[PDB]
């Protein structure tokens with residue numbers, strides 16, 4: 119059984135796009151992003167705990183962290199479920215990417231359905247930046263765009 | 272356990288608002304709404320099956336109908352899960368409403384998290400209007416605003 | 425084994441006052457009110473589910489209802505845990521009252537600590553008003569003042 | 578699952594802000610802070626034992642101290658449950674911070690629900706100051722703002 123989900127990303131910063139999720143049974147989640155309007159280079163890319171946009175991207179809460187770990191890189195053992203690292207924006211301010219991840223299921227108790235994916239202004243230091251925010255947020259700066267992960271037909 | 276969800280409504284019409292859901296354990300869901308920029312009178316108010324806004328409110332699919340019944344009133348046995356009837360908009364374009372319902376859980380197999388709320392242009396006839404659409408949609412006309420039901424707590 | 429809690433009640437309305445809670449062991453909760461700046465007559469008096477005042481009293485959510493019952497009078501089997509009925513305001517717009525209730529404990533899983541006590545603009549119809557809001561809120565109108573129930577020394 | 582709490586800060590000093598708490602299962606508590614109106618530099622940031630605001634912040638009692646230890650730094654063994662160290666205020670009088678800590682649960686017997694967060698006038702000396710108040714309050718001076726930790730989700 120395939121579950122499908124899609125986030126339409128908006129923001130006050132003119133960055134836009136979609137992120138498409140799929141998961142067959144209880145295997146990995148495939149996530150395919152198409153982003154525009156971003157500063158060239160690395161941008162923090164997170165699943166946040168909430169899909170509350172009452173105060174734009176600021177109300178989506180902290181990083182999704184059911185395991186109660188510190189902030190890290192996707193490859194790390196010591197990471198949040200929602201830590202999908204950096205996406206690289208081209209010189210035209212677009213990004214197109216597929217990542218596969220094992221901690222962002224689309225069903226069961228840790229489902230990210232109805233949570234928000236968030237693109238950040240700045241790189242995610244992956245917990246290694248030695249800044250006060252490194253080990254909590256990765257010090258990725260402003261939530262320039264976010265989208266609620268909605269069930270797809 | 273206390274589960275919360277919220278829909279932030281938007282459309283092409285200059286209509287806005289917030290719909291707050293709460294469910295304590297497996298008691299009924301309380302839905303609390305304040306809406307603006309709507310035409311005075313009754314509007315059909317439903318949970319639709321999908322949270323896909325890639326084609327705006329149109330991609331949110333039909334009334335959430337896990338039981339495979341026809342369209343009806345909230346108090347009827349022959350209703351969609353998503354069938355929450357009419358909300359009443361004042362001459363000032365605003366609606367203020369509280370309803371309880373036990374067919375829109377915020378967790379488990381029939382969870383509405385990551386689906387959508389839609390306010391329709393016209394009244395829901397509650398399946399009793401004897402119109403060709405009465406038994407599917409309640410002939411509630413177009414999708415004026417919708418919001419993905421995002422996890423809030 | 426006595427637990428003590430107190431709410432300091434704030435409004436936009438200039439109604440204010442305090443509600444003091446005590447519970448010996450597993451016994452009933454005693455709640456003593458001193459209120460001012462209120463319209464003479466009966467006022468809906470509820471424990472709401474949340475102590476969130478980010479949006480003044482409107483963020484305190486619905487009636488505290490762990491049993492998933494409908495809105496009732498305190499003496500009814502079919503009531504919310506939060507349903508403390510009506511408090512009577514004198515001509516001088518003050519109220520002083522003591523009630524005891526066994527559904528608002530100050531510890532355990534259904535503790536009211538860190539929830540909100542709310543005084544409404546209008547009488548609570550105790551679910552017998554024959555209004556659309558009777559069975560959900562008792563149709564008691566605006567939240568004129570609320571206070572977070574804080575642990576007392 | 579997910580428990581949320583929120584303190585809306587007030588005081589005599591024009592300091593404002595919101596502190597949001599999230600705990601997933603029995604993991605650490607994330608506390609996310611947005612403050613304004615504060616003098617620049619480090620400020621003591623503590624959970625106090627009580628949510629009694631009848632005498633403003635002074636009635637919130639001492640540091641939350643269920644284990645009966647002395648005042649210390651968050652990473653110390655000998656510390657109060659309520660010891661969350663210093664938050665830095667920029668020259669513009671604002672503080673934005675994310676802290677995670679495993680002694681401030683939002684449920685069970687050591688719950689901080691219905692207690693208070695307090696922001697102090699002065700830096701927390703983390704118990705190291707050699708002052709008579711070092712091992713009790715970290716000599717962090719006045720209670721410049723506080724709020725009751727209200728249940729939010």
Ligand SMILES: [Cu+2]
Pocket residue numbers: 162164166236238258
């Ligand atoms: Cu982020």
Ligand SMILES: [Cu+2]
Pocket residue numbers: 315316317334389391408411
């Ligand atoms: Cu509809």
Ligand SMILES: [Cu+2]
Pocket residue numbers: 468469470472487542544561564
């Ligand atoms: Cu009420």
Ligand SMILES: [Cu+2]
Pocket residue numbers: 621622623625640695697714717
């Ligand atoms: Cu202190």
Ligand SMILES: [Zn+2]
Pocket residue numbers: 181188189190198200201254255256
């Ligand atoms: Zn993270």
Ligand SMILES: [Zn+2]
Pocket residue numbers: 317334341342343350351353354407408409
């Ligand atoms: Zn229907």
Ligand SMILES: [Zn+2]
Pocket residue numbers: 470487494495496503504506507560561562
């Ligand atoms: Zn009630």
Ligand SMILES: [Zn+2]
Pocket residue numbers: 272273274275424578579580581730
């Ligand atoms: Zn919850």
Ligand SMILES: [Zn+2]
Pocket residue numbers: 623640647648649656657659660713714715
């Ligand atoms: Zn201390």
